[PDB]
Amino acid sequence: ADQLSNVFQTRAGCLIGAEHVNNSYECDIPIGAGICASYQQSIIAYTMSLGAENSVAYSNNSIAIPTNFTISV
Amino acid sequence: STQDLFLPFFSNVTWFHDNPVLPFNDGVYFASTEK
Amino acid sequence: DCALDPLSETKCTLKSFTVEKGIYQTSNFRVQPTESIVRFPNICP
Amino acid sequence: VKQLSSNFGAISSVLNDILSRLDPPEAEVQIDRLITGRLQSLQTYVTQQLIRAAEIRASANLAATKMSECVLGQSKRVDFCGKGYHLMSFPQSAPHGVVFLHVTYVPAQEKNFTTAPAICHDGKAHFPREGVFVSNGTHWFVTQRNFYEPQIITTDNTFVSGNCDVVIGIVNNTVYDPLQPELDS
Amino acid sequence: TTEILPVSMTKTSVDCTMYICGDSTECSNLLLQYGSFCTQLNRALTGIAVEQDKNTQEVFAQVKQIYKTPPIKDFGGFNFSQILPDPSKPSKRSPIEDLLFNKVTLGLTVLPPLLTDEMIAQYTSALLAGTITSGWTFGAGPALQIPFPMQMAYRFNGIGVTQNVLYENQKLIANQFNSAIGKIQDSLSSTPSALGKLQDVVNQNAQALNTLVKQLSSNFGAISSVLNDILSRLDPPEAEVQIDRLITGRLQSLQTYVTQQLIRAAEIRASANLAATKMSECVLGQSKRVDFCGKGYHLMSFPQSAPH
Ligand SMILES: *[C@@H]1O[C@H](CO)[C@@H](O)[C@H](O)[C@H]1NC(C)=O
Ligand SMILES: *[C@@H]1O[C@H](CO)[C@@H](O)[C@H](O)[C@H]1NC(C)=O
Ligand SMILES: *[C@@H]1O[C@H](CO)[C@@H](O)[C@H](O)[C@H]1NC(C)=O
Ligand SMILES: *[C@@H]1O[C@H](CO)[C@@H](O)[C@H](O)[C@H]1NC(C)=O
Ligand SMILES: *[C@@H]1O[C@H](CO)[C@@H](O)[C@H](O)[C@H]1NC(C)=O
Technique behind the model: cryo-EM
- CA A40 to CA D25: how far, in whole Å? 69
Say if strands D97-114 and D124-128 run parallel, antiparallel, or are unpaired: unpaired
What's the CA angle centered on E226, arms E223 and E229, to 5 degrees? 65
Q: Where are the beta strands (DSSP E) in chain D?
A: 85-94, 97-114, 119-121, 124-128, 132-134, 141-143, 158-163, 171-172
Q: Which residues of A touch E115 (CB under 8 A)?
A: 34
E290 inside 8 A of chain D by CB: no
Given a contact cutoff of 8 angstroms between Cβ atoms, the answer to whether E182 and E166 are in contact is: no
CA distance linking residue D83 with residue D99, whole number of Å: 16
- Expressed in angstroms, the distance from the first to the final Cα of chain A is 50
Q: Is the dihedral of CA E192, E198, E202, E208 positive or negative?
A: positive
Taking the centre of ligand 1 as the mean of its atom positions, its distance from the CA of residue A44, in whole angstroms, is 14
Cβ-Cβ contacts under 8 Å, A2 against chain C: 5-6, 9, 26-27
DSSP state, residue A62: E
Nearest to D127 by CA among E153, E157, E163: E163
CA-CA distances (angstroms) from residue E20 to C31, E23, E29, E38, E243?
18, 10, 12, 10, 11
Residues of chain B positioned with their CB less than 8 A from the CB of C15: 1
- Smallest CA-to-CA distance from D158 within D120, D102, D105 is with D120
Cα of D184 vs its chain's centroid, Å: 55
Instruction: Tell me how far apart the alpha carbons of residues E187 and E93 are, in angstroms, rounded to a whole number.
Output: 19
DSSP string, B1-35: ---S----TT--------------SS---------
CA D105 to chain CA mean position, Å: 15
Question: For A1-73, where are the E strands, in sequence order?
Answer: 7-9, 14-16, 19-20, 29-30, 35-39, 43-47, 62-72
CA atoms of D185 and D178, how far apart (whole Å): 14
Cα separation, D155 vs A44, in Å, equals 67
* D52 sits in which H/E element: helix D24-66
Inter-CA distances, E62 with B25, B31, D82, Å: 65, 65, 13
Contacts of A59 in chain E (CB under 8 A): 145, 147
- Asked if E279 contacts E292 with a C-beta cutoff of 8 angstroms, the reply is no
What's chain A's length in residues?
Answer: 73
- Cβ of D151 below 6 Å from ligand 3: no
Residue E170: how many other CB atoms lie within 10 Å:
20
Pocket residues for ligand 2 (CB within 6 Å)?
A 57, 62; D 112
Closest protein CA for atom 13 of ligand 4: D169
Q: Taking CA atoms, what residue in A is nearest to D132?
A: A63
Q: Is D161 exposed, middle or buried (0-12, 13-18, 19+ CB in 10 A)?
A: middle
The neighbours of chain E, by the rule of 3 or more Cβ pairs under 8 Å, are A, D
β-pairing, A43-47 vs A19-20, is parallel
Phi, psi of E174 (to 5 degrees): -60, -40
> For E95, what's the count of Cα atoms within 13 Å in the CB-facing half-sphere?
12
- Using DSSP's 3-state secondary structure scheme, residue A25 falls into strand
Question: How far, in Å, CA of E174 to CA of E178, rounded?
Answer: 6
Q: Taking a C-beta distance cutoff of 8 angstroms, is the pair E277, E261 a contact?
A: no
Chain E residues within 8 angstroms (CB to CB) of chain A: 53, 63-70, 74, 76, 111-116, 118-119, 122-123, 126, 129, 133-134, 141-147, 150
Out of D114, D135, D139, give the residue to mutate to test ligand 3, the one with the largest number of ligand atoms within 8 Å of its CB: D139
Cα D126 versus chain centre, distance: 38
Residues of D in contact with E136 (CB under 8 A): 78
Q: Which residue among D6, D79, D117 places its CB closest to the CB of E150?
A: D117
Nearest CA in chain C to B10: C4
Contact E307, E127 (CB under 8 A): no
E160: left (phi over 0), alpha (psi -120 to 50) or beta: left
User: Choosing among A10, A55, A59, which should be mutated to test the E contact, i.e. which has the most E CBs within 10 A?
Assistant: A55
Q: Do chains E and B touch (3 or more CB pairs under 8 A)?
A: no
CA E192 to chain A, closest CA, distance in angstroms equals 31
CA angle E189, E194, E198 (to 5 degrees): 115
Do residue D112 and residue A64 have CB atoms under 8 angstroms apart? yes
**C-alpha distances in angstroms, D42 versus A18, D4, D49, E35?**
46, 10, 11, 14
Which of E43, E48, E41 is CA-nearest to residue E12? E48
Contact E92, E86 (CB under 8 A): yes
Q: Do chains B and C touch (3 or more CB pairs under 8 A)?
A: yes
How far is the centre of ligand 1, averaged over its atoms, from the C-alpha of E111 (Å)? 28
CB A63 within 8 A of CB E133: no
Q: Per-residue b/e over E240-250, b at no fewer than 16 CB within 10 Å?
A: bebbeebbbeb
CA distance E307 to E103: 10
Q: Taking a C-beta distance cutoff of 8 angstroms, is the pair E55, E8 a contact?
A: yes
Rounding to the nearest 10 degrees, give the CA dihedral for residues D118, D121, D122, D126: -40
Q: D154 and chain A: CB distance < 8 Å anywhere? A: no
Whether residue E308 contacts residue E117, with contact meaning beta carbons closer than 8 Å, is answered with no
Q: What are phi and psi of A29, to 5 degrees?
A: -120, 125
Residue owning the nearest CA to atom 7 of ligand 2: D112
- If you write DSSP's letter for every residue of E182-216 in order, what string do you get? HHHHHHHHH-GGGGTTHHHHHHHHHHHHHHHHHHH
